[PDB]
Amino acid sequence: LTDLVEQPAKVMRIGTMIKQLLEEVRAAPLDEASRNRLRDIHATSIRELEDGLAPELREELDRLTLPFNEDAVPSDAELRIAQAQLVGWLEGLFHGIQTALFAQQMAA
Amino acid sequence: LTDLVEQPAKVMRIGTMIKQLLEEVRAAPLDEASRNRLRDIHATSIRELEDGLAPELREELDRLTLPFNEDAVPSDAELRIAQAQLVGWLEGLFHGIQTALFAQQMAA
Amino acid sequence: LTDLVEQPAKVMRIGTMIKQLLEEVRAAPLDEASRNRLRDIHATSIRELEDGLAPELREELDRLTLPFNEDAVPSDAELRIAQAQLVGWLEGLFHGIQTALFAQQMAA
Amino acid sequence: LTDLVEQPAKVMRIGTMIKQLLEEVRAAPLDEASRNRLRDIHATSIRELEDGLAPELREELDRLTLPFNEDAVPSDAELRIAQAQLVGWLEGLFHGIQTALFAQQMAA
Amino acid sequence: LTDLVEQPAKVMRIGTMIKQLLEEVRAAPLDEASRNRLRDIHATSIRELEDGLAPELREELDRLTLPFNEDAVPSDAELRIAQAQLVGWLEGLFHGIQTALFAQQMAA
Amino acid sequence: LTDLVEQPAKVMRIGTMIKQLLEEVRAAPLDEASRNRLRDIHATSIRELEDGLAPELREELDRLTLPFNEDAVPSDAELRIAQAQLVGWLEGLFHGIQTALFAQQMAA
Amino acid sequence: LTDLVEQPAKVMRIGTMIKQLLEEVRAAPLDEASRNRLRDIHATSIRELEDGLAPELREELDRLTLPFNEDAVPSDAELRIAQAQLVGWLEGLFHGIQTALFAQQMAA
Amino acid sequence: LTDLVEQPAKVMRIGTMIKQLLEEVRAAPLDEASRNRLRDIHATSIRELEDGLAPELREELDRLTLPFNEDAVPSDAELRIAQAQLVGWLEGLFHGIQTALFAQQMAA
Amino acid sequence: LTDLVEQPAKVMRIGTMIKQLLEEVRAAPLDEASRNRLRDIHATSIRELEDGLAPELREELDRLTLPFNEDAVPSDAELRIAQAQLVGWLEGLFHGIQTALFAQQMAA
Amino acid sequence: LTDLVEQPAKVMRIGTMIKQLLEEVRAAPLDEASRNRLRDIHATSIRELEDGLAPELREELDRLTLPFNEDAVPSDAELRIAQAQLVGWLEGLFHGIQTALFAQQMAA
Amino acid sequence: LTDLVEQPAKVMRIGTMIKQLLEEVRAAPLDEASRNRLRDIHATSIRELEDGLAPELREELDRLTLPFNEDAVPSDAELRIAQAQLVGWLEGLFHGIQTALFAQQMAA
Amino acid sequence: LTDLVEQPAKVMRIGTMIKQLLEEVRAAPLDEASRNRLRDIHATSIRELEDGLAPELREELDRLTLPFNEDAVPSDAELRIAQAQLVGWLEGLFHGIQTALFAQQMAA
Known part of the structure; x- marks a missing residue:
């Protein structure tokens, strides 16, 4: 199925970014400037x-x-x-990709 | 398994999305806009x-x-x-799915 | 015996849905709309x-x-x-079912 | 002893149901309606x-x-x-059931 | 000494009951109705x-x-x-019965 | 051991009873009636x-x-x-008793 | 040496009685009756x-x-x-006694 | 991939510097001077x-x-x-870097 | 060194007594009577x-x-x-005692 | 490469001095004299x-x-x-340096 | 270097004393009498x-x-x-003495 | 190592002294006299x-x-x-010192 994620290095890059930023938002509340920034970032x-x-x-x-x-x-x-x-x-x-890797590389 | 899940990658994908969003709703209360957005996302x-x-x-x-x-x-x-x-x-x-998988891997 | 649960995939499914929902009601109080909703879901x-x-x-x-x-x-x-x-x-x-299975696969 | 519990699956079901509901009674105080329902359930x-x-x-x-x-x-x-x-x-x-049972499994 | 406990299945049954009920009394205070009930139960x-x-x-x-x-x-x-x-x-x-079992079944 | 405890089952029995009742007295304060009862029990x-x-x-x-x-x-x-x-x-x-038992089991 | 503690069964007995009683005095305060009682017991x-x-x-x-x-x-x-x-x-x-025993049974 | 990070030592340095400073921002609120310095550092x-x-x-x-x-x-x-x-x-x-790297080390 | 502690059993007794009483002083504040007794005990x-x-x-x-x-x-x-x-x-x-002692037991 | 840190003994030294000092500033607030002092030390x-x-x-x-x-x-x-x-x-x-060393001593 | 500590049994004796007394001072504040005493002790x-x-x-x-x-x-x-x-x-x-012992008795 | 520490026992000695005194300053606030004394000790x-x-x-x-x-x-x-x-x-x-020691013990 790896046909689905064309550039994997890039998706775990960005995914890791967004995960981190969400962990920041939880930390403490933002001001108008920060919230605006994070919208732009999301787009x-x-x-x-x-x-x-x-x-x-x-x-x-x-x-x-x-x-x-x-x-x-x-x-x-x-x-x-x-x-x-x-x-x-x-x-x-990525749960999809990795479960595929383990089952197949198990057969093989 | 087919009789259950035609597209396994997709159902697990979306499932994780819903689980994470449920974790956010639990995190802290929403506003008029966010709960509206989550209604859409649910649909x-x-x-x-x-x-x-x-x-x-x-x-x-x-x-x-x-x-x-x-x-x-x-x-x-x-x-x-x-x-x-x-x-x-x-x-x-998916618990049903995995009981089926373990049945196959026990059979062969 | 095993003939008691005709569709096991389905009862572990629905069972897990009820388990989760009860855990939500415990989480924090519901309103007339939500608790009405769980009436429907229970029936x-x-x-x-x-x-x-x-x-x-x-x-x-x-x-x-x-x-x-x-x-x-x-x-x-x-x-x-x-x-x-x-x-x-x-x-x-399901505790009955699993003790029965362990008994049988203990026999063979 | 075996003669004591003629339907084991059923007494284990009912038991788990009763234990679970008792833990709900512990969760938070009930209303007149809930107390009535739970009485019925008891009978x-x-x-x-x-x-x-x-x-x-x-x-x-x-x-x-x-x-x-x-x-x-x-x-x-x-x-x-x-x-x-x-x-x-x-x-x-059931503690009686399994102490006798273990005695048998140690015997043979 | 097992000559002492004529029906053991029954004594660990009731003993387990009373133990459980005592653990209930500790949980939270009773009303006249409950205390009365538990007296009857004790007799x-x-x-x-x-x-x-x-x-x-x-x-x-x-x-x-x-x-x-x-x-x-x-x-x-x-x-x-x-x-x-x-x-x-x-x-x-039961401390008596079980210490007897271990010492004797140790010799034997 | 005989020179110590003529009836071991009985002394351990009663001892456990007293220990448990001491645990209750510690649990929470008693009334006129209960402390009277425990006086009797002690005698x-x-x-x-x-x-x-x-x-x-x-x-x-x-x-x-x-x-x-x-x-x-x-x-x-x-x-x-x-x-x-x-x-x-x-x-x-009983600590004396067990030092004696270990002495015997070390001797033989 | 070992001739110092003529009756060892008795001194570990009484010693444990004093240990427990001190633990009670620490538990919560006594009254004139109780603390009088422990005077007698100590003597x-x-x-x-x-x-x-x-x-x-x-x-x-x-x-x-x-x-x-x-x-x-x-x-x-x-x-x-x-x-x-x-x-x-x-x-x-008793620390002296037990280090002596370990020394002897280390010798032999 | 290797072509992606041409200077690895330097990007790892800078990264650790940035992560450390973020944890300082978390430590306690900054003043106008500190916020200015940390902006510069960011650029x-x-x-x-x-x-x-x-x-x-x-x-x-x-x-x-x-x-x-x-x-x-x-x-x-x-x-x-x-x-x-x-x-x-x-x-x-870098997660991209080491997932590819581990693929190579498993290959040879 | 061995020449330093001529009566080991006795100095260990007295030591444990002193340590135990110090921990009582820590337990809760003493009265004039207790302070007097504990002074005597010290002398x-x-x-x-x-x-x-x-x-x-x-x-x-x-x-x-x-x-x-x-x-x-x-x-x-x-x-x-x-x-x-x-x-x-x-x-x-005594730390002196056992460091020398361990030196001897390593020597032979 | 290794030629980057000319004097390694000295940079782990000074690095540890800065690490400790930062941990102090976090400990509790400084006065004009102390914080002036750390300016000098930083330069x-x-x-x-x-x-x-x-x-x-x-x-x-x-x-x-x-x-x-x-x-x-x-x-x-x-x-x-x-x-x-x-x-x-x-x-x-230093993370760069140590991953490089592990790479080399992994090679040889 | 053991030429440095002429009487080691004595230095770990006194060192252990002073360590203990410092642990006492931390426990709770002293009065004029105690502080005076501890000065004398220090000399x-x-x-x-x-x-x-x-x-x-x-x-x-x-x-x-x-x-x-x-x-x-x-x-x-x-x-x-x-x-x-x-x-x-x-x-x-003593860190000096013991590190010397381990390195040398390692060679030897 | 000599190029670093001419007297290792002495520098580790004094270092531990300074570390302990830093632990005391952290413990609780000082007076005019004590902070004066610690100034001297530092010099x-x-x-x-x-x-x-x-x-x-x-x-x-x-x-x-x-x-x-x-x-x-x-x-x-x-x-x-x-x-x-x-x-x-x-x-x-000293971290520099130990990296040198491990280098020697790896060489020989």
């Missing part, structure tokens, strides 16, 4: 993520994803929600 | 779950599933209930 | 369990369970009670 | 327990058990006493 | 206990035991005292 | 202890023992002292 | 220890101990002090 | 990071990174966001 | 310690020790200082 | 580090570090920031 | 310490040591300072 | 440290060292800084 990280994925997962991700509004600073809640979604989605994707 | 996530499930499990899931009304923003409580339901349903589903 | 979840059980256990479960009243929203308490009973009943059913 | 559960027990133990259990007064809702305390009793009685019963 | 459990014991221990137990008054509800303290007495007495009795 | 328990002890230990125990006056209800403190005394005396007694 | 317990000791240690212990005054109820403090001294003295005596 | 550190990275990753990092507004002192929050990002990006980068 | 205990020590260590201990002023009751603090000193002096003494 | 400590580094790392470190102003006492915060940066920078430098 | 312990040391360490110790004033009771702080100095000095000295 | 301890160090390390230490002015009593903060500095410098020094 860019999804751009870069679609690049490292096959059209299958690009479009699935697009279907699950809700872009943000720029006319308003999103809440610390919306930021937690938006990033947690991507963290779960990625962690389940 | 779309069921959409995407139906694809990787045989029609039996499609319809069983539907019988267990409770759509939200777009005429009111649901409470953090309803969101905890809706997401928790899919998390339990999914884990009992 | 249909029993339906779906009855599908996966032999006439013996269908009829026993029917004797032990007290359907909810549609005429009023049940308490956070009654929901814990109703879910807990099926959780204990199922966990004891 | 019906003794009904189902007598079935899987030899008349000897049927009658000993009945001598140790105390029906409730249907003219009044029992306290969360009376429910704790009654269920606690059946939980202890049951574990002390 | 019956001693009746059933004397049955499973040789005349030796029946009468020793009688000498150590103080029946309750029915003209008054005993305190949570008297109930703790009364049951703790029987729990200690039983646990020391 | 009777010494009665029963004398039987399983050689006359030497009968009289040594008596020299260490302090009867209560039936003209006043003793404090929870006096009860803690009286019961603690027998618990220590008994454990040092 | 006779020393008597009974003197029985089980060679002239050497009888006379040394007499030099170290300060009998109590019968003319006043001793403090919770003096009782802890008086009991603690015999506890340390005995524990050091 | 200079991205300068030094671009050097040890292939133009591919140079440009991806630049697309993900957000320069600060020198016309105002950023919050302790913006500093937490920016450094947190580079820490996640870096660990997800 | 008498140094008397008994000098006996089991060679004149060398007899005199070194006397040079390090400070008699108390019998014209006034010493604080719980002075008692902590004096006993604490003898406890440290004693452990540092 | 000279960088000097002494530059001695033990190849031209490469001297110049890089110079680019990353921001000397302090002699015209004002720096905050407890700036001191933590300034020390933390060198702590991370050094720890990353 | 004497240094006298006895110089005896068990070669002139080298006698004079080094003298150079590091600050005698106390007798015209004033030193603070609990000065007493902690004075004793901690000696505890550190001694522990470093 | 003298550097005096004594210079002896066991090659002239290189003498002068490096001096470049890192900051004397106190005898015209003012330094704060507990300055003392924490001054002592912490020597503790870090010393540990990085």
Whole structure:
């Protein structure tokens, strides 16, 4: 299925980034400036993520994803929600790749 | 196994996404916007779950599933209930899958 | 005997869904909307369990369970009670099944 | 001894159900509705327990058990006493079962 | 000495019951109804206990035991005292039986 | 060993009873009735202890023992002292017994 | 040497009785009746220890101990002090004995 | 991949420096002077990071990174966001390095 | 060295007695009576310690020790200082004993 | 490569001095005298580090570090920031060195 | 180097003493009488310490040591300072002796 | 090693002394007298440290060292800084020493 993740080095790069940033948001509350920043960051990280994925997962991700509004600073809640979604989605994707590796390299 | 899960990678993917989002709802209370977003995510996530499930499990899931009304923003409580339901349903589903796998690996 | 649980995949599934939901009700209090929602879920979840059980256990479960009243929203308490009973009943059913399997595969 | 518990699967089911509900009573205080439901559950559960027990133990259990007064809702305390009793009685019963069983497995 | 405990399955049954009920009394305070109930329970459990014991221990137990008054509800303290007495007495009795088993089955 | 404990089962029995009751006195404060009952239990328990002890230990125990006056209800403190005394005396007694047993099992 | 503790069974007995009683005085405060009681127990317990000791240690212990005054109820403090001294003295005596035994059975 | 990180020693240095400083930001709130210094450190550190990275990753990092507004002192929050990002990006980068490396060491 | 502690059993007894009493001083504050008793115990205990020590260590201990002023009751603090000193002096003494002893047992 | 750290003894020395000092600033707040003192120590400590580094790392470190102003006492915060940066920078430098050594001694 | 500590049994004796007494000072605050006492003790312990040391360490110790004033009771702080100095000095000295023993007895 | 530490026993001695005194300063706040004494100890301890160090390390230490002015009593903060500095410098020094020792023991 590895046909799904075109650039894996890149997806565990960005996924690790977003995971880290979410762990930051939990730490302590943000101000308008920070929340704004993290929105921008989220848009860019999804751009870069679609690049490292096959059209299958690009479009699935697009279907699950809700872009943000720029006319308003999103809440610390919306930021937690938006990033947690991507963290779960990625962690389940790599669960797929690694379970495939273990079963197959077990036969072999 | 096929009679259960047509697309295993996809159902585990989406399942992890829902589990993580349930962990966020538990983390701290949401606002009007975030709980709205999570309502959407819940709807779309069921959409995407139906694809990787045989029609039996499609319809069983539907019988267990409770759509939200777009005429009111649901409470953090309803969101905890809706997401928790899919998390339990999914884990009992995959527990079935693994009992089947262990049966095969015991047979051969 | 084994003929008691006609569909084992399905009862471990639904059982896990009830287990999770009870854990949510314990988490923090629900509102009229949420607890109403779990009434619905409890009624249909029993339906779906009855599908996966032999006439013996269908009829026993029917004797032990007290359907909810549609005429009023049940308490956070009654929901814990109703879910807990099926959780204990199922966990004891599966304890019977697994001690039986260990007995047989201990024989052979 | 074997003659004591004629239906083992059923007495283990019912037992686990009773123990689980007792732990719910511990969780948080119940309302009049919940206390009523849990009383019923207690009565019906003794009904189902007598079935899987030899008349000897049927009658000993009945001598140790105390029906409730249907003219009044029992306290969360009376429910704790009654269920606690059946939980202890049951574990002390099966403890008999497995001490004899282990004696047999050591014998052969 | 096993000549002492005529019906052992029964004494570890009841002993386990009373132990459990005492663990309940410690949990949280009782009302008049519960304390009354637990008195009744104590009388019956001693009746059933004397049955499973040789005349030796029946009468020793009688000498150590103080029946309750029915003209008054005993305190949570008297109930703790009364049951703790029987729990200690039983646990020391089974200490006797099991130390005998280990020493003798060691020689043998 | 005989020169110490004429009836070992009985002295260990009663000893455990006293230890458990001391654990209850520690648990929470008693009332007029319960502390009265425990006074009785203490008297009777010494009665029963004398039987399983050689006359030497009968009289040594008596020299260490302090009867209560039936003209006043003793404090929870006096009860803690009286019961603690027998618990220590008994454990040092049985510690003597086990040093003797280990001597025999080392000899043969 | 070993001739110092004439009756070892008795001194480990009484020693354990003093150890327990000190642990009670620490538990919670005593009243005039209880602490009076421990005065009596301390005086006779020393008597009974003197029985089980060679002239050497009888006379040394007499030099170290300060009998109590019968003319006043001793403090919770003096009782802890008086009991603690015999506890340390005995524990050091038995440490000597056990290091001697290990030395001898190390020799042979 | 190897082509991705051209100067490994240098990118690891800079990374550890950034992670350490982020943990200082967590330690306690900073003053305007400290926030200014740490901003500078952030800018200079991205300068030094671009050097040890292939133009591919140079440009991806630049697309993900957000320069600060020198016309105002950023919050302790913006500093937490920016450094947190580079820490996640870096660990997800080197995670790529060692997953490929381990693949090679398993191959040969 | 061996020449240093002429009576080892006795110095170990006295030491354990002193250490135990110091821990009582720690337990809770003493009264004038207890402080007086414990002073006496301190004086008498140094008397008994000098006996089991060679004149060398007899005199070194006397040079390090400070008699108390019998014209006034010493604080719980002075008692902590004096006993604490003898406890440290004693452990540092026997530490000498066993370091030399272990040297011998490694030699042969 | 190894030619980067000209004097390794000296840089682990000075590095440990900075590590400890940062741990003190965290311990409890400093005064104008102390924090002035750490300004001096930071400036000279960088000097002494530059001695033990190849031209490469001297110049890089110079680019990353921001000397302090002699015209004002720096905050407890700036001191933590300034020390933390060198702590991370050094720890990353030595992580590079040790992974290189393990690589070489893994080769041979 | 053992030429340095002339009487080792004595230095670990006194060192252990002073260590213990310092652990006492930390426990709870002293009164004028106790602090005075512990000063006296410190002077004497240094006298006895110089005896068990070669002139080298006698004079080094003298150079590091600050005698106390007798015209004033030193603070609990000065007493902690004075004793901690000696505890550190001694522990470093014995670190020297024991590291010498291990390296040499390793060659040998 | 000689090029580093001319007198190893002495530098480790004094180092441990300084470490212990730093532990006391941390323990609890000092007075005018104690902090004065520790100033002296710090000066003298550097005096004594210079002896066991090659002239290189003498002068490096001096470049890192900051004397106190005898015209003012330094704060507990300055003392924490001054002592912490020597503790870090010393540990990085001895860490260098042990890397050298392990090099020798790996070579031979």
